[PDB]
Amino acid sequence: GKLQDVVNQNAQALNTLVKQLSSNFGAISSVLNDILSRLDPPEAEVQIDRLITGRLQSLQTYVTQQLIRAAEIRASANLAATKMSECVLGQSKRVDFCGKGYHLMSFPQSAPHGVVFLHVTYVPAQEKNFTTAPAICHDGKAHFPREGVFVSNGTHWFVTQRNFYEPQIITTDNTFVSGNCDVVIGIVNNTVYDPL
Amino acid sequence: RLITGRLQSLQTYVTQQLIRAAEIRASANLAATKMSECVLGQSKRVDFC
Amino acid sequence: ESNKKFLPFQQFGRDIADTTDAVRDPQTLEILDITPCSFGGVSVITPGTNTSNQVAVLYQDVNCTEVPVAIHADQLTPTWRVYSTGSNVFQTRAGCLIGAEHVNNSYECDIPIGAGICASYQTSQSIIAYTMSLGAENSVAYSNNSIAIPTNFTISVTTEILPVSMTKTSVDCTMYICGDSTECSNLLLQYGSFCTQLNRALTGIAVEQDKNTQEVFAQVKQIYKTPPIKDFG
Amino acid sequence: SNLLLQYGSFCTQLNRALTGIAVEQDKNTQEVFAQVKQIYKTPPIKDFGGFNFSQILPDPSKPSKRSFIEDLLFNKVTLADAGFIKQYGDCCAQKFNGLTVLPPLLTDEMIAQYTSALLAGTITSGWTFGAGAALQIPFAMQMAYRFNGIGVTQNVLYENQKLIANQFNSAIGKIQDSLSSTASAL
Amino acid sequence: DLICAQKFNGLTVLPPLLTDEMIAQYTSALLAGTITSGWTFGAGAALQI
Amino acid sequence: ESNKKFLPFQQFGRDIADTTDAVRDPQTLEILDITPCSFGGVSVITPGT
Numbered sequence: 001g002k003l004q005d006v007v008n009q010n011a012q013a014l015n016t017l018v019k020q021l022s023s024n025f026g027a028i029s030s031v032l033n034d035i036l037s038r039l040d041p042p043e044a045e046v047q048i049d050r051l052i053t054g055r056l057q058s059l060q061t062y063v064t065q066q067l068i069r070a071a072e073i074r075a076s077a078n079l080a081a082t083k084m085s086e087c088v089l090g091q092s093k094r095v096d097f098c099g100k101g102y103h104l105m106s107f108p109q110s111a112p113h114g115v116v117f118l119h120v121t122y123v124p125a126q127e128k129n130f131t132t133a134p135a136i137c138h139d140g141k142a143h144f145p146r147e148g149v150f151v152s153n154g155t156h157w158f159v160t161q162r163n164f165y166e167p168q169i170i171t172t173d174n175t176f177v178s179g180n181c182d183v184v185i186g187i188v189n190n191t192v193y194d195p196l
Numbered sequence: 197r198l199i200t201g202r203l204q205s206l207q208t209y210v211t212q213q214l215i216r217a218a219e220i221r222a223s224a225n226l227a228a229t230k231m232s233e234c235v236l237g238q239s240k241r242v243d244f245c
Numbered sequence: 246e247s248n249k250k251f252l253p254f255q256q257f258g259r260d261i262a263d264t265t266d267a268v269r270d271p272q273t274l275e276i277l278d279i280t281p282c283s284f285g286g287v288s289v290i291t292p293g294t295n296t297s298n299q300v301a302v303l304y305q306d307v308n309c310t311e312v313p314v315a316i317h318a319d320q321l322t323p324t325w326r327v328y329s330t331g332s333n334v335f336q337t338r339a340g341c342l343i344g345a346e347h348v349n350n351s352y353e354c355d356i357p358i359g360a361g362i363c364a365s366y367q368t369s370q371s372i373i374a375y376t377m378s379l380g381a382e383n384s385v386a387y388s389n390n391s392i393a394i395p396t397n398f399t400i401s402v403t404t405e406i407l408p409v410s411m412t413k414t415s416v417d418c419t420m421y422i423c424g425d426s427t428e429c430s431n432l433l434l435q436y437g438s439f440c441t442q443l444n445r446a447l448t449g450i451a452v453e454q455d456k457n458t459q460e461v462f463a464q465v466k467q468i469y470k471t472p473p474i475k476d477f478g
Numbered sequence: 479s480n481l482l483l484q485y486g487s488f489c490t491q492l493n494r495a496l497t498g499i500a501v502e503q504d505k506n507t508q509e510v511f512a513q514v515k516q517i518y519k520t521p522p523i524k525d526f527g528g529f530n531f532s533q534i535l536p537d538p539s540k541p542s543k544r545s546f547i548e549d550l551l552f553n554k555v556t557l558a559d560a561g562f563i564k565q566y567g568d569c570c571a572q573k574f575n576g577l578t579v580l581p582p583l584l585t586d587e588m589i590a591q592y593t594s595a596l597l598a599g600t601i602t603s604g605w606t607f608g609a610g611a612a613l614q615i616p617f618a619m620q621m622a623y624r625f626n627g628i629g630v631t632q633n634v635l636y637e638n639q640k641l642i643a644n645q646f647n648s649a650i651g652k653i654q655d656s657l658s659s660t661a662s663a664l
Numbered sequence: 665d666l667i668c669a670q671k672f673n674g675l676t677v678l679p680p681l682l683t684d685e686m687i688a689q690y691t692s693a694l695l696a697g698t699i700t701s702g703w704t705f706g707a708g709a710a711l712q713i
Numbered sequence: 714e715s716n717k718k719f720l721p722f723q724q725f726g727r728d729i730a731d732t733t734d735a736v737r738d739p740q741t742l743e744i745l746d747i748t749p750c751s752f753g754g755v756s757v758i759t760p761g762t
């Protein structure tokens with residue numbers, strides 16, 4: 001639809017330019033060959049000067065509205081040259097720039113006077129409720145996860161990544177230690193296993 | 197004399213509106229990028245949000 | 246009848262843009278108001294002639310009891326007189342809509358009317374008018390120790406269309422204004438250089454249309470081929 | 479009106495231009511505000527870790543379901559009757575010379591319902607509602623992953639949580655005073 | 665014997681510089697780089713993976 | 714010489730811009746075309762002078 005509306009606006013403007021050649025603008029005719037075959041040179045000038053003035057007006061209005069319309073195809077072609085660099089030749093972190101979801105890759109296809117981009121994205125499906133906690137107190141020390149969240153299936157405590165449920169055992173090689181236990185609002189007693 | 201004088205004042209008014217409307221269009225495309233990248237996400241672009 | 250009090254030597258009043266909007270009658274020396282007789286536009290709502298042929302008509306800013314007399318409904322065709330009076334009369338902020346059925350549902354917008362009202366062709370089949378809906382309600386189960394984690398995913402592929410160039414035209418300025426006549430083209434020389442100015446503007450548009458395509462598509466300068474054995478996992 | 483017929487179609491062409499401008503003003507609003515297809519509501523509990531969002535969330539004690547800050551903005555943009563939109567636009571009684579004002583498609587209370595669904599989805603979900611389905615997370619745990627995205631470790635949030643929530647609350651309080659003084663930024 | 669540059673009162677249409685077959689060769693070289701080499705071809709020489 | 718298919722009640726033919734493109738001889742009753750003669754559509758390729 002966005003490509004067809006450009007062809008429709010560029011054709012209404014050229015049909016208005018042809019149709020305005022059949023207006024007389026105050027003269028005795030719209031045909032220039034009938035003014036010239038009916039009037040002597042002094043009288044003819046006053047009639048051809050009305051056609052010249054009115055037809056110069058029609059060309060001037062066409063050209064002005066083509067300059068405004070060409071300035072927004074240039075804005076739209078600069079956006080498409082940015083999406084070719086950042087969505088096709090790279091992987092983008094800007095939200096909703098290349099599609100809907102988390103961007104993986106894009107594929108460029110050619111259309112008439114245009115371009116079509118096929119955005120491949122990642123969408124997260126069915127979810128589940130869990131219980132969570134900001135930190136875990138073990139030996140008078142708080143432990144925070146290195147990359148993930150602390151979840152609980154009801155009895156045990158795991159650590160998982162944020163975009164896929166894949167729970168694991170809380171060891172000292174996926175957490176880190178800082179500070180005391182009385183400073184974190186919501187800390188939870190559990191054990192931190194030691195792999196060595 | 198009055199018809200061509202009044203057609204010219206309408207023609208001037210409409211051309212100024214087509215140039216102002218092209219500037220609100222550029223400012224509403226910036227506001228739609230700041231809604232997707234600053235409100236619906238967290239941005240790394242310096243001085244954007 | 247008005248509320249303004251003139252000074253006793255003033256004959257009529259004006260407003261900021263200098264239009265007459267109050268007058269004094271020269272026999273009983275009272276002040277009257279002037280208000281224009283009502284006008285507006287007539288818009289026709291159709292579902293497309295590949296589908297049906299029944300339409301609805303919107304009359305802008307009328308109050309809708311003035312519709313049969315604002316148009317000349319006694320002087321119109323009997324197939325035009327159906328759309329001035331009926332059971333399907335609805336008064337909105339955008340004007341008054343005649344020929345559509347005011348349901349109480351809410352759907353997505355199909356043909357916009359204004360101030361929150363849309364119109365579509367579903368229901369046999371008829372033309373309806375409804376307040377548009379923004380989307381389904383929802384509520385997130387927030388609490389201070391609850392999280393939701395996804396357990397699966399979905400690979401999605403969407404599509405985005407962008408215009409890049411447009412049609413390159415050119416006008417021969419002398420042949421449009423007066424083709425082949427040589428006593429006209431001697432009169433066109435008295436208007437200065439308007440034909441070199443128009444050709445110069447239209448040429449710069451056409452050259453830009455080719456620069457628009459170089460910057461989108463011609464970003465790499467090696468022409469890679471794809472291998473014949475397509476083992477892409 | 480019969481001498482005007484000699485100038486061809488200069489007036490179906492001027493009305494065609496002002497209608498493309500008017501159709502485009504409605505596409506501008508749906509581009510900005512209509513970016514979610516679910517209308518989220520915020521829960522009646524307000525345990526947001528100590529962060530106080532009462533001035534930007536809507537209150538039901540008004541017919542216009544706008545926030546407190548959204549109402550200082552609406553009583554600040556005005557007109558000194560300097561032209562013609564005050565003579566026709568905001569209502570009508572018609573004006574002379576064939577000049578009208580058309581109403582927008584989304585009303586002012588439809589736009590405020592859109593910006594309360596973006597606020598309720600940020601506070602309760604984080605960024606997940608803009609990429610799929612909204613998955614809830616506590617607000618202090620959400621703020622620790624935004625510290626982690628600027629290069630500060632997440633124990634700096636939890637150890638300074640009461641101080642961080644106090645600096646935020648006093649900074650929303652100064653937005654009002656910069657919008658209650660008459661020296662308007664609008 | 666149709667010369668119809670002079671048949672529409674001066675109005676013509678100029679042809680584009682890149683044909684529709686040259687544009688389709690550009691978009692297949694962009695795919696033949698993404699699929700075989702990732703994002704490395706947009707920052708240097710293409711390295712397969 | 715034209716091969717337009719007139720009817721026996723015609724003196725000339727027209728097009729969209731209301732210009733005469735075909736006419737009939739008032740003696741031999743023969744339909745012939747009219748087409749202009751300038752050919753202004755001429756471009757000049759050059760290096761510098």
Ligand SMILES: *[C@@H]1O[C@H](CO)[C@@H](O[C@@H]2O[C@H](CO)[C@@H](O)[C@H](O)[C@H]2NC(C)=O)[C@H](O)[C@H]1NC(C)=O
Pocket residue numbers: 153154155156
């Ligand atoms: C929570 O997860 C733990 C860890 O897997 C579950 O404990 C195991 O449950 C299975 C049941 O199929 C037993 O065979 C294992 O021996 C259990 N292991 C331990 C260490 O307890 C536990 O059942 C889960 N709880 C709930 C409510 O789902």
Ligand SMILES: *[C@@H]1O[C@H](CO)[C@@H](O[C@@H]2O[C@H](CO)[C@@H](O)[C@H](O)[C@H]2NC(C)=O)[C@H](O)[C@H]1NC(C)=O
Pocket residue numbers: 189
């Ligand atoms: C989590 O574990 C800690 C340490 O085992 C508990 O802290 C102790 O609680 C008992 C009973 O309240 C006190 O007598 C001790 O003095 C506490 N120790 C310290 C170092 O403060 C803590 O209560 C546990 N949390 C819960 C909810 O049971």
Ligand SMILES: *[C@@H]1O[C@H](CO)[C@@H](O[C@@H]2O[C@H](CO)[C@@H](O)[C@H](O)[C@H]2NC(C)=O)[C@H](O)[C@H]1NC(C)=O
Pocket residue numbers: 271272273
């Ligand atoms: C113009 O003449 C008419 C006709 O007499 C005046 O109208 C009368 O004015 C008197 C006031 O002296 C009223 O009591 C009458 O009711 C009016 N009507 C008639 C029918 O007598 C009118 O006042 C004059 N206007 C002027 C002098 O400005």
Ligand SMILES: *[C@@H]1O[C@H](CO)[C@@H](O[C@@H]2O[C@H](CO)[C@@H](O)[C@H](O)[C@H]2NC(C)=O)[C@H](O)[C@H]1NC(C)=O
Pocket residue numbers: 396397398
């Ligand atoms: C994740 O979703 C996919 C589909 O989106 C699931 O695969 C389906 O599995 C069921 C039962 O095994 C089949 O009936 C469907 O035909 C499968 N779909 C496809 C496309 O093959 C998959 O099982 C889901 N993952 C989990 C863990 O349930």
Ligand SMILES: *[C@@H]1O[C@H](CO)[C@@H](O[C@@H]2O[C@H](CO)[C@@H](O)[C@H](O)[C@H]2NC(C)=O)[C@H](O)[C@H]1NC(C)=O
Pocket residue numbers: 530531532
């Ligand atoms: C959130 O901040 C607002 C700031 O306006 C607090 O509202 C004020 O609360 C104080 C204490 O009762 C009153 O003296 C003010 O009159 C209140 N102002 C308004 C406009 O209501 C509000 O209490 C804070 N919320 C919480 C939970 O602390």
Ligand SMILES: *[C@@H]1O[C@H](CO)[C@@H](O)[C@H](O)[C@H]1NC(C)=O
Pocket residue numbers: 127128129386
């Ligand atoms: C999580 O819990 C809430 C209420 O406890 C419930 O409405 C919601 O559906 C649950 N989530 C899932 C994925 O079942």
Ligand SMILES: *[C@@H]1O[C@H](CO)[C@@H](O)[C@H](O)[C@H]1NC(C)=O
Pocket residue numbers: 295
């Ligand atoms: C709609 O238009 C298409 C376009 O050719 C035509 O083929 C078809 O018969 C039309 N009617 C329908 C789909 O009812």
Ligand SMILES: *[C@@H]1O[C@H](CO)[C@@H](O)[C@H](O)[C@H]1NC(C)=O
Pocket residue numbers: 308570
């Ligand atoms: C529209 O009609 C109602 C019906 O009485 C009337 O009360 C109202 O004033 C009218 N509105 C106008 C004329 O603007």
Ligand SMILES: *[C@@H]1O[C@H](CO)[C@@H](O)[C@H](O)[C@H]1NC(C)=O
Pocket residue numbers: 347348349
């Ligand atoms: C729509 O709802 C209003 C609300 O009171 C009611 O008055 C009206 O009758 C309803 N319209 C119908 C049932 O067509």
Ligand SMILES: *[C@@H]1O[C@H](CO)[C@@H](O)[C@H](O)[C@H]1NC(C)=O
Pocket residue numbers: 185186389390525
């Ligand atoms: C979390 O919410 C529960 C339920 O309202 C409340 O009892 C508990 O005190 C809250 N946690 C903290 C740390 O305040």
Ligand SMILES: *[C@@H]1O[C@H](CO)[C@@H](O)[C@H](O)[C@H]1NC(C)=O
Pocket residue numbers: 739740741
């Ligand atoms: C007119 O005269 C010529 C004589 O050369 C003749 O050929 C032609 O048929 C005549 N046309 C008529 C009588 O309509």
